[PDB]
Design an enzyme around this catalytic site. Sequence first.
Site, mmCIF file in Angstrom:
data_model
loop_
_atom_site.group_PDB
_atom_site.id
_atom_site.type_symbol
_atom_site.label_atom_id
_atom_site.label_comp_id
_atom_site.label_asym_id
_atom_site.label_seq_id
_atom_site.Cartn_x
_atom_site.Cartn_y
_atom_site.Cartn_z
ATOM 1 N N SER B 135 0.852 -1.165 0.000
ATOM 2 C CA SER B 135 0.000 0.000 0.000
ATOM 3 C C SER B 135 0.912 1.247 0.000
ATOM 4 O O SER B 135 2.094 1.144 -0.258
ATOM 5 C CB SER B 135 -0.868 -0.089 1.260
ATOM 6 O OG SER B 135 -1.824 0.945 1.301
ATOM 7 N N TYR B 149 -3.245 10.325 -7.685
ATOM 8 C CA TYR B 149 -2.172 9.357 -7.556
ATOM 9 C C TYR B 149 -2.119 8.799 -6.099
ATOM 10 O O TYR B 149 -1.926 7.599 -5.897
ATOM 11 C CB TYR B 149 -0.800 9.967 -7.885
ATOM 12 C CG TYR B 149 -0.605 10.315 -9.342
ATOM 13 C CD1 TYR B 149 -0.444 9.306 -10.296
ATOM 14 C CD2 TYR B 149 -0.630 11.648 -9.752
ATOM 15 C CE1 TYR B 149 -0.271 9.629 -11.676
ATOM 16 C CE2 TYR B 149 -0.475 11.999 -11.150
ATOM 17 C CZ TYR B 149 -0.282 10.977 -12.083
ATOM 18 O OH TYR B 149 -0.098 11.294 -13.417
ATOM 19 N N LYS B 153 -4.090 5.011 -4.649
ATOM 20 C CA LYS B 153 -3.042 4.063 -4.235
ATOM 21 C C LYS B 153 -3.396 3.564 -2.802
ATOM 22 O O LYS B 153 -3.363 2.360 -2.542
ATOM 23 C CB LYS B 153 -1.686 4.793 -4.224
ATOM 24 C CG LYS B 153 -0.451 3.935 -3.883
ATOM 25 C CD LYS B 153 -0.047 2.979 -4.987
ATOM 26 C CE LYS B 153 1.300 2.318 -4.624
ATOM 27 N NZ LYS B 153 1.731 1.353 -5.629
#
EC number: 1.-.-.-
Lengths: 249, 249, 249, 249
Positions: B135, B149, B153
């Site tokens: 992660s 982004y 994620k």
Amino acid sequence: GKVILVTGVSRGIGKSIVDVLFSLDKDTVVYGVARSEAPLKKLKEKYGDRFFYVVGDITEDSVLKQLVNAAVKGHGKIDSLVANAGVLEPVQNVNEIDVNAWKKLYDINFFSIVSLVGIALPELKKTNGNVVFVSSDACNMYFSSWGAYGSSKAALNHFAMTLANEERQVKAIAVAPGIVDTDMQVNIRENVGPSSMSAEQLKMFRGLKENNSSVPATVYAKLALHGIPDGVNGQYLSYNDPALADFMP
Amino acid sequence: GKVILVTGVSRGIGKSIVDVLFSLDKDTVVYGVARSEAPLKKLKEKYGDRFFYVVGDITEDSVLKQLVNAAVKGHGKIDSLVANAGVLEPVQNVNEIDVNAWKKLYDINFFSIVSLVGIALPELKKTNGNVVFVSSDACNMYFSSWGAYGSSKAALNHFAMTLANEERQVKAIAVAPGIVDTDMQVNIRENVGPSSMSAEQLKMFRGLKENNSSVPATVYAKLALHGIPDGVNGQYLSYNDPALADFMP
Amino acid sequence: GKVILVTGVSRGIGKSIVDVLFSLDKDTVVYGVARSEAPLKKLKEKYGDRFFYVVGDITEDSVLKQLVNAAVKGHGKIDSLVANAGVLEPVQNVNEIDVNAWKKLYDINFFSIVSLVGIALPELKKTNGNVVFVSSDACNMYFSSWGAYGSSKAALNHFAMTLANEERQVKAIAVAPGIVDTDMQVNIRENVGPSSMSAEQLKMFRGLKENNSSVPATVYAKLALHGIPDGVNGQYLSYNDPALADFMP
Amino acid sequence: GKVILVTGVSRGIGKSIVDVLFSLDKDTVVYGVARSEAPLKKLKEKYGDRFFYVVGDITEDSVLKQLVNAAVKGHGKIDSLVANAGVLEPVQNVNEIDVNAWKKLYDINFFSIVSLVGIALPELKKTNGNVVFVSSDACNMYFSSWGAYGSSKAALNHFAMTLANEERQVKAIAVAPGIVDTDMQVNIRENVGPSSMSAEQLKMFRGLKENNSSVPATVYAKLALHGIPDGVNGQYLSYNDPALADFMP
């Protein structure tokens, strides 16, 4: 040049931030403090009359007033403060539910810094100065097994936001350094008992230490020198957040 | 030996995790996937019939079923999955408020992984296996200037907790690697326009890249090999949380 | 008067926000949307030519363009958008690790709103307008057993910050309402299977519903009417954060 | 019956939790503490020898030992502790950067509770008992303008996790009540100066008060009576998280 106070300078990232400040600018003056005189003398010998120090525990208000008085006496003002509790190290009884040990750790990692900001605040107001906190990455506080070591260290995060709301003539920011701040010099392991660190904490701590900076030190140093942007005043961020791109090396 | 699927293996931390898995254990078999065949061939040439791969985009369900079918066909089972979206790279129009580009990034960083877990879940149930997510540390989501982004994620963090609540025969954990996962090989800068990354994002990205792992790769690798402890099932943690001390090098 | 678009208006807090807007100001015009026409007709009958609506699913871009075109056609501009996914309700297969069901919920709670902001953004730029998100309190995301219902709903929090960084001519804020947004009208329990909500989710959901607003609706309404303060642009806050004191009743 | 200690019982949610405990079970005994004797007498008059109290400030360790000794003397054991700092109220100089005022608030909201847990811990170990913290919802700490009032109150969240990791014979949980805990009785406004609360804090505070519980009180009461589930030991959750469905009314 800018007059900058820096705490926790004996080791780890606080020492690096002093080193970086002097390499960035020929005019800056730094007043540092640490509990041990040896590494302060070594900094004084390297940087001469660009560097001044007080030796002692910043959980003593007298040490804080000495440091603030010494900067105003010697250079007439204070532009910035890099508020840093210094490197992680075992402290007695913190791995117990022991209010005395917790209060002592919170004074080391949080209240001494609150006290220092209060003491320096009237000089910082004079120069519309900056308070840069060296906070912890363990904002995964979400889940953390670092016990009081983590929660006390991370208390600076909310403090930045509260200081910047309450004191509009100054700016403040709390920046996490992307590492657990430890002493970087090769050291003999110390005998640490389970009331001070759990077995897991000690084993990770040693791992991290035996693994460990100039990059995040630069971010702090450039914020202290050039000032905190309005758009990040009050916030807590990793050193590698894009809003800090202009403070990188 | 354990049969382990690993995604995002061409570069960065996903590649390191494969390297680490093979160095830890002589019996483990790994099935990896990446979009480019070159580095998969290189892994196959180095590790031989310990390594198998499928080439393609895991945002294709057909690629996911190929990879899962290939592991059950070739080795009869699946023990663990290291679910990794792979390295940060510019993607078109993500720095715009553009639902099409956001959906595409969320499919890359989040939904393909959801799809893969769903596809592999019946085999993982058979072995009471483990799902280890790679992660992001940008759980400073609190404040983040990484735009989509970062949020796409980090969506794996809550997903770990939901999967472990909903599927009791498997364990799951989401671990942040203490770095922004980037390609580590020295590369020419790419011409990246402002609709894809803001100027700040691009400047930090390059800085980080031009600065960048075996330590956090080991944590993921040891969790996949030895299993996730009950006390951290469902959680999201930094690789350096003390609850993970036994998964360090 | 200000022209304000409001989504999710059939029930719960979205309906209250429309009610509050009309009671605060005699000049404001509202364009709302909901999937069911009945409660839209009832709003039109109560408020007359202060209220206009489109019936349909905002996961359809055609519905979004209808609503935006209708406001610019009918009143020449758009001042503010109250972006609200609407009340919590069971959705098929969300309590399974089922990528199709997750994508559909994320489109309901997150992507349709991203799409709407993108569509309305050029009109909002013209008036330097405001985007107010009705986000969730389940920022205890830290720990949450609401599965995808919670994570998809809370995705608006980071989106506010990203929109305000990327689009400087508009302001944005995400405000949690201090309740789980549910239909407030006394309703027969619906037969909900375990693939849609776990037993725990269903039991809490019913409890909350059988327990459930004008106060937080006012905060959203006053932000949309008077504008978002610079000091909270980009942030996510509870309706009862002191920085919002001037937006209370 | 279970022997349960409850702090902060004079007003707000702490008073409700006592009321709820007695309505749920005919056998339970409660030892409470508050600083003012009046409402303790009223509780004693209503509930008789089901209720016992000590009057005083739990920032005094002597008061804590009195309360713990009184429970073991009178009923031979302690099953559970509902650790509650009590209602929000203005405290002198907290809206200043004043280390003395911050230490005093942290002792009220956090350290007295740490001290109480340490004092009661050996009795709780005897019964494998439960520690239920009444924590704050202002886990939007993410952004919060409540200054030290918020950060000190929320410090119980991480403390729950640390206590449950460190003391395996007990369980602990921190639950947010879905409201800002205030005195619910109709009161004259008090003259509050700006060193104690900012104008915004005071205005929100009054709003909240002039607006304000049996539902979240029940969750705390049922956790203390029936025990904390293994799956939530160590966590911090809203009272309305689905993992707590069986502790609702």
